[PDB]
Write a protein that binds this ligand. Structure first.
Ligand code: PLM
Ligand code: PLM
Ligand code: FE
Ligand code: FE
Ligand code: FE
Ligand code: FE
Lengths: 285, 285
């Protein structure tokens, strides 16, 4: 369907729009290139490990690589829906969001290639709870926006994508990586990537907060929907977390070798903490 | 609809894919930030001009600002359609494409703001031929891809967007800017922007060539469709060009003041030249 006109012909960008400001910050802070990361020490680290130690790291990478690829593909309906609503500054910012996620896909895939597991199918580490979130609930909620851009649908999409996948799972994953491999002194290239991803993620989560809050601001009963959609996904969040913890507990050779008292009870509490603080970042009023 | 799996979990990025290579070049060559361009001399240049000289430059900027905004919004269905086909490297590259166009929208809108015309509605310089391309034919061809990603539809979308809007009109616009204002010594910030846009455009056009050629390669009768879709749009291409030429011929005070023998016959021939060389960049065989 046609364009009725163009904002930057009739007027200009809204330079004070929060999402224009975030776009500007993304340009300034988003120059890193996965192609510049030196993975040569990562290759040697991985080769030095025993088979039982090698596998320790793969469930988490399996979760991230699928996660990055899903969100790269699944942000497109959000960009479309806000575009169709004329929210030009949102769209400008979402171009940086999409490109960030492409670089994230690239980073993990370069690490897999470099350490010699690119040929390994890591889908075996996606349990039913993970698939419910990433293979199903995430694309369902985002693709809905092509035919239903109601405030309800937009809140649901931002909740699943920005508040759960990013704001709870990705953030806890970054913490888990540092708690384990930063301690061990392992995988410096991967951990450099993680630091860049974690910095990008701040803007992604801020977009979701802004999107959810601006809809809540119109009608404070959307606050209840946000909470409900958060709670709907929690069983799968913790179900996946419990599955990874069980795998960690059953393959402890990396932890012993590297003197990591890996506190899974504490990682579990960080996830709960993330989930609850994302809820608190939306105001009913 | 769901994800059946993820390429970077089952395997890796296809590192040798042409669109991965283009993505890599876009990261390396796409660091420029419109926010860094110094428009202060542009403001003084524009203020120095008489009213009749001021207006000389506005039809071309009106064409570009709407053009950039349209392509920012209208590339999203192409990204979606290739995503749904599993063409991950194409999608990675298209994130740089989208972000480039966002920066282009930003550049022209910053120039308009800086020279004091942000409040002026430049839609008056879009004639019927321009609207047929940008308000209608471009969004029609791109949005079709949401429900019809047939080789025919993809060739039509790439032809209108990459070969006509970018490969014929944008390229001729860059040439026109340099022929006029680079000569005059005017608007150094705008011309810096034009050089960055022209560099980005090379990758955009290369994406369209690759997309059209890979479909032609499957069935050489799609070559005829490419030619037909090019010729379908030519009347509006030249109809818009003739309209801008007529405006230039009727407001020659900038040209006199600045000693520009503006050769409109030569600009017209450059457009024809662009159109014909884009056709020659697709091989029937
Ligand atoms: C053992 C402790 C459990 C910690 C939780 C680990 C979760 C792994 C993360 C996988 C999903 C990554 C989602 C990426 C989202 C994005 O890139 O925006
Ligand atoms: C007077 C000589 C005519 C020269 C032709 C001028 C055409 C102006 C360009 C306006 C459309 C710009 C399209 C931008 C496309 C993109 O950003 O990829
Ligand atoms: Fe990410
Ligand atoms: Fe993210
Ligand atoms: Fe452009
Ligand atoms: Fe372009």
């Amino acid at each position: 369907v046609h364009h009725d006109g163009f904002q930057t012909v009739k007027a200009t960008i809204d330079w004070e729009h929060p999402m224009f400001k975030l776009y500007e910050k993304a340009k300034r802070n988003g120059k890193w290139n996965p192609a510049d990361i030196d993975f040569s020490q990562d290759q040697k680290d991985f080769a030095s490990l025993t088979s039982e130690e090698k596998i320790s790291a793969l469930p988490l990478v399996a979760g991230f690589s699928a996660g990055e690829e899903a969100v790269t593909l699944d942000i497109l309906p959000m960009a479309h829906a806000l575009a169709r609503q004329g929210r030009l500054e949102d769209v400008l910012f979402l171009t940086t969001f999409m490109h960030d996620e492409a670089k994230h896909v690239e980073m993990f895939s370069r690490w897999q290639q470099a350490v010699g597991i690119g040929q390994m199918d890591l889908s075996v580490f996606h349990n039913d709870h993970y698939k419910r979130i990433f293979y199903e609930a995430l694309p369902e909620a985002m693709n809905r926006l092509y035919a239903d851009d109601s405030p309800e649908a937009v809140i649901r999409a931002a909740t699943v994508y920005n508040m759960i996948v990013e704001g709870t799972l990705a953030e806890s994953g970054y913490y888990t990586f540092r708690q384990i491999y930063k301690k061990a002194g392992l995988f410096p290239g991967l951990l450099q990537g993680i630091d860049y991803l974690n910095m990008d993620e701040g803007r992604h989560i801020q977009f979701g907060i802004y999107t959810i809050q601006r809809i809540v601001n119109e009608d404070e009963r959307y606050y209840e929907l946000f909470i409900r959609y958060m709670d709907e996904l929690w069983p799968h969040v913790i179900g996946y977390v419990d599955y990874l913890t069980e795998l960690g507990k059953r393959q402890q050779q990396l932890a012993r070798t590297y003197a990591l008292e890996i506190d899974y009870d504490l990682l579990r509490h960080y996830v709960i903490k993330q989930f609850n603080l994302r809820k608190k970042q939306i105001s009913r009023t």
